[PDB]
Design a protein around this ligand. Structure first.
Ligand SMILES: */C=C/C1=C(C)C(=O)N/C1=C\C1=NC(=C\c2[nH]c(/C=C3\NC(=O)C(C=C)=C3C)c(C)c2CCC(=O)O)/C(CCC(=O)O)=C1C
Length: 483
């Protein structure tokens, strides 16, 4: 019965809302096919009253439907299927699935004049051609963002990248003129709490037909079998958190639809479509996006590792240049401090320090004091050959490696505090009408929430950045020992 406030919202059970969106009806069955619960609108949408204890009957739901249901009813492992069928006055999409051991049948009115197979195929071809045309991982995102809008007619579609700390950044955008831009918006990991994030990962597509909707409750609330709520995780019609709804209306959005990009076990980022009036996307089309989601995820994965590959390649090429120079010139300092192949170019940094013997070369600033303090901190830890941190002198980020012990051969890279890369301003943008929860649920409030998180922090060191440092360290050890 608990109200969901700003304090609660982190722990909101959004998977068991026990209600569904109004653009469809829902019937929940148990293993034997016996009805356990239904949305309060089954009668109003489909001509009949589903009742707990009942079993579904032909042409109160039609034949092919039970035909489908029986197949999944007798199959081990998460059944999933859909049928198209006429029930009374209308034809329906009857998407059905089984999660836990409860079976779900979802009913959407089908208004499309097209054959489903071809509608599905047509859109799949169109939206994944965008995945064959681009080598830049950012062109991919940018282009499919522009294309998703062309296909769906959404007012605004955005592509979100998720950082290491699960904070988000709007990296692409295609929007109708009128609308303010959110390009470069960065948002925290909290803007999408655990359960919501778990769900985007498990579900390629989420659709919100109308944010201003009144939910259609499924009765009864609790599954008699367990005396605990129905887990609508894989339910297409599952209802929305009032918090998110308030957020979206603060923005002035009325319909959403998001396509996930999952790589590893991580939500790599999603495409968020936003409409200013309510909007619906037919089932077969959503399936076009679902399959797309899986392929795009695959290509983004490769494109990203193709990116790291090239980073490693030019790094070694520079380690080669470095090895070449060092042996022939015989001062390392000159080699390391080289303007372009120098260490400052090896790994993205705002500065670097080279330190062998008693001599100190600070390149791109005065870093001698910091390096001294960092080194003192490592006093307590004589065995550390590598040190790094984004919390901390005057530079937040530090990556230090040791290549000579006795003569204190050290290398440092430094990073300043992370800064909002792109920022809007210039003319006060319009007044958002703000709900009861407060300004926290506006983009402006989200951004501020993000600042408070990152400030005091430099950008984390790449998986890649550390790998390079490690290779460099090996190089110099080799050199110093060798000659
Ligand atoms: C207390 C937890 C939450 C805060 C704070 C908050 O802002 N939202 C919170 C809970 C959820 N958010 C969910 C999804 C979600 N989050 C945002 C916020 C942004 N995304 C952006 O890209 C930007 C700016 C560029 C912002 C400000 C949005 C738009 C959404 C909608 C999901 C989508 O776009 O697909 C969320 C899950 C929602 C769901 O159930 O679909 C929760 C629970």
């Amino acid at each position: 019965i608990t109200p969901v406030t700003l304090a609660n919202c982190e722990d909101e059970p959004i998977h068991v809302p026990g209600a569904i969106q109004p653009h469809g009806a829902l019937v929940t069955l148990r293993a034997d096919g016996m009805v356990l619960a239904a949305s309060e609108n089954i009668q109003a949408l489909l001509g009949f009253v589903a009742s707990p204890g009942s079993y579904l009957t032909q042409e109160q739901v039609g034949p092919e439907v039970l035909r489908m249901l029986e197949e999944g009813l007798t199959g081990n492992g998460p059944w999933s299927n859909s049928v198209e069928t006429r029930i009374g006055e209308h034809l329906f999409d009857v998407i059905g699935h089984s999660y836990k051991e409860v079976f779900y049948l979802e009913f959407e009115i089908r208004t499309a004049d097209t054959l489903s197979i071809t509608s599905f195929t047509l859109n799949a071809q169109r939206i994944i051609a965008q995945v064959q045309l681009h080598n830049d991982t950012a062109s991919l995102l940018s282009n499919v963002t522009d294309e998703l809008r062309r296909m769906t007619g959404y007012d605004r579609v955005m592509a979100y990248r998720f950082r290491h700390d699960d904070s988000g950044e709007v990296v692409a955008e295609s929007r109708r003129e009128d609308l303010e831009s959110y390009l470069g918006q960065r948002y925290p990991a909290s803007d999408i709490p655990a359960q919501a994030r778990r769900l985007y990962i498990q579900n390629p597509i989420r659709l919100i037909a109308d944010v201003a909707y009144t939910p259609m409750r499924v009765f009864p609330a609790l599954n008699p079998e367990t005396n605990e709520s129905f887990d609508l995780s894989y339910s297409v019609l599952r209802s929305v958190s009032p918090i998110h709804c308030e957020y979206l209306t603060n923005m002035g959005v009325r319909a959403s639809m998001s396509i996930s990009i999952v790589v590893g076990g991580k939500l790599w980022g999603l495409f968020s479509c936003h409409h200013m009036s309510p909007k619906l996307i037919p089932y077969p089309v959503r399936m076009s996006f679902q399959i797309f989601s899986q392929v795009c995820s695959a290509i983004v994965e490769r494109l990203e590792q193709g990116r790291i590959a090239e980073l490693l390649r030019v790094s070694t090429e520079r380690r080669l240049a470095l090895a070449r120079r060092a042996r022939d010139a015989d001062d390392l300092f000159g080699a390391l401090a080289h303007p372009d192949d120098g260490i400052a170019a090896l790994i993205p940094c705002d500065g670097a320090l080279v330190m062998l013997g008693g001599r100190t070369l600070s390149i791109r600033g005065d870093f001698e004091r910091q390096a001294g303090n960092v080194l003192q901190r490592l006093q307590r830890d004589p065995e550390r050959d590598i040190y790094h941190t984004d919390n901390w002198g005057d530079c937040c980020g530090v990556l230090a490696i040791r290549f000579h012990r006795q003569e204190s051969g050290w290398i440092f890279w430094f990073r300043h505090e992370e800064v909002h890369r792109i920022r809007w301003g210039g003319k006060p943008e319009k007044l958002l009408t703000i709900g009861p929860s407060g300004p926290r649920l506006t983009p402006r409030g989200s951004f501020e929430a993000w600042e408070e998180v990152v400030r005091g922090h430099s950008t984390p060191w790449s998986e890649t950045d550390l790998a390079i440092a490690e290779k460099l360290r090996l190089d110099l050890m080799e050199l110093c020992l060798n000659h």
